[PDB]
């Protein structure tokens, strides 16, 4: 085995084609499927795996009741093949209500945050064994990317946030070598709140499009230099802000130096990346709720500030169908680094006051240099046929 360098150029992206689906909620009506939330996808050099934060119960269970709480002692990081639903044979790789799993070309690294909200432990498990651990430094709900980390030359980089979810918080980039934390650099730059980053390799470093839960409806970008451990940050220059809640396209703005202060009182995990001067991004259809999901390219949206010229729009999920956390993962091609994204479709409480649980499915798209068509790939699970 060899360390992943991601030195290949990012190949041309003209759109996103479906790559995988879960159907977890539909199979939950008859099968024994884990209750999961906040999933992600990470690919080892041969094949792609899906991770989730299971509530320590199945959907057709008495413990699935009131599974809406984001942090319980029983939450575990479930990991399996991309495509195989989270059945009873799933491997719980660690205890976590906030995780980040990613492969360095030799072994998996899992950052798993558990324990009390004020006093939390982040365990760094490499090659199946616990190699490191840190504690909360701000003593306020320590968390991590909730997506895949990025390892360049074996030096994985994770983004750990500690502090208020509606105020200033300390965000640190931890550089980990074979499970051992070799460096820690606090976030520096123009980003005033970094949380739940959707990191992807951009050689020779890492680029993470994070979520601003304090004031910004525009997603901050954090560039991580794995060579000299320098962290820089700004915001997205595109005027089409990809973080909901937000303002509609007519009255939205983003000057990519400060948060826009436009309905920034909350956020959702999202993603974006740069194709030349253009920016590929994904955002929910609704401006207030996490309903629907489109992906589009904004022309000159990475360089020119407040750019609103979108093109190649795709409707991943229709407006009337629930969505959730979305994220980006990179897959090594034959000669390029393809960018793929996943969308979480949340079902249950509190939006649907029919069932008592709160579970999710995942739909995974990948970028293609060829052509594609339209369509919608929602949950497809009728809440009336699901167990209460």
């Amino acid at each position: 085995a060899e360390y992943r360098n991601w030195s290949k150029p990012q190949c041309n992206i003209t759109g996103f084609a479906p790559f995988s689906k879960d159907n977890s909620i539909r199979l939950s009506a008859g099968g024994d499927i884990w209750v999961t939330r906040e999933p992600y996808v990470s690919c080892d050099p041969d094949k792609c795996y899906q991770f989730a934060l299971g509530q320590g119960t199945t959907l057709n269970n008495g413990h699935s009741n009131d599974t809406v709480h984001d942090r319980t002692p029983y939450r575990t990081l479930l990991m399996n093949e991309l495509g195989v639903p989270f059945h009873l044979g799933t491997k719980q790789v660690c205890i976590a209500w906030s995780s980040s799993s990613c492969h360095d070309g030799k072994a998996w690294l899992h950052v798993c945050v558990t324990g009390d909200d004020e006093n939390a432990t982040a365990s760094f498990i490499y090659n199946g064994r616990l190699v490191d651990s840190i504690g909360s430094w701000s003593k306020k709900i320590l968390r991590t990317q909730e997506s895949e980390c990025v390892c360049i030359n074996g030096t994985c980089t994770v983004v750990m946030t500690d502090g208020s979810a509606s105020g200033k918080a300390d965000t640190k980039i931890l550089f980990i070598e074979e499970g051992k934390i070799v460096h820690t650099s606090p976030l520096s730059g123009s980003a005033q709140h970094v949380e739940e980053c959707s990191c992807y390799p951009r050689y020779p470093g890492v680029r993470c499009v994070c979520r601003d839960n304090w004031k910004g409806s525009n997603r901050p970008i954090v560039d991580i230099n794995v060579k000299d451990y320098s962290i820089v940050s700004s915001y997205v220059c595109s005027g089409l802000v990809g973080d909901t809640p937000r303002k509609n396209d007519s009255s939205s703005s983003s000057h990519c130096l400060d948060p826009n202060n436009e309905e920034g009182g909350h956020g959702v995990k999202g993603w974006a990346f740069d194709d030349g001067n253009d920016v590929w991004m994904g955002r929910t259809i609704s401006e207030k709720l996490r309903s629907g999901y489109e992906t589009f390219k904004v022309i000159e949206g990475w360089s020119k500030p407040n750019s609103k010229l979108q093109i190649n729009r795709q409707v991943i999920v229709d407006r009337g169908n629930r969505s959730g956390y979305s994220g980006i993962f990179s897959v090594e091609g034959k000669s390029c680094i393809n960018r793929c994204f996943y969308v979480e479709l949340i079902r249950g409480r509190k939006q649907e006051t029919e069932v008592l649980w709160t579970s999710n499915s995942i739909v995974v798209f990948c970028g293609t240099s060829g052509t594609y068509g339209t369509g919608s790939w929602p949950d497809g699970a009728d809440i009336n046929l699901m167990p209460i």
Partner: antibody
Amino acid sequence: VQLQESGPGLVKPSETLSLTCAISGDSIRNSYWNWIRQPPGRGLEWIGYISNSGSTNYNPSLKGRVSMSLDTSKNQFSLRLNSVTAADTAVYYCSRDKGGLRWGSRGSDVFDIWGQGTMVTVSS
Amino acid sequence: SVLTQPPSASGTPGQGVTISCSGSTSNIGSNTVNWYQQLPGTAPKLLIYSNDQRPSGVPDRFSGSKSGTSASLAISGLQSDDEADYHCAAWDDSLNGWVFGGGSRLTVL
């Protein structure tokens, strides 16, 4: 902010040149701090930057004879160039890189604030 | 430097001059370029960043553009106050630092 440089105008060859940059206004806890050098009648040359987080970067062309440090208590930061040669004489500016992306089509206002500079001469 | 500039670039008052920085792939070709104005005897001052943007205070007569692995700074108006050195800085990727390669002195006859 205002960056003020202070160093020995004359440095003997093969000795060590110790420059200092004092920072007013904003404290040295939130940005990267770089040193640039301009030889007389030549263009600017980047020396390296250091942040209080421990993130440091140096110019490989200097052959690792450079050392920079920060002092938040004094709100200052210093350059410790080692084994100076006759070609090391230049005007040394201290500047600030407030962050901002450095890859791709989007950059930032790096070196927005400079210092008036100090003419470090190397001779006997 | 790695960046290459003409030793000088001249133009008559009222007209406009374009100063060119030439870079490599791990250079202006893939990263942005910042244009700094250094008056004779003083510290360099930021004029252009991100190849288009202007700091608050820089006049609109200064404009920037990038063509592949090269960058151009256009100075319209061109009064006698613009006689200064112009440096182009790009974040290099093969050395993980900054490259200037400056030396372009603008004279307005």
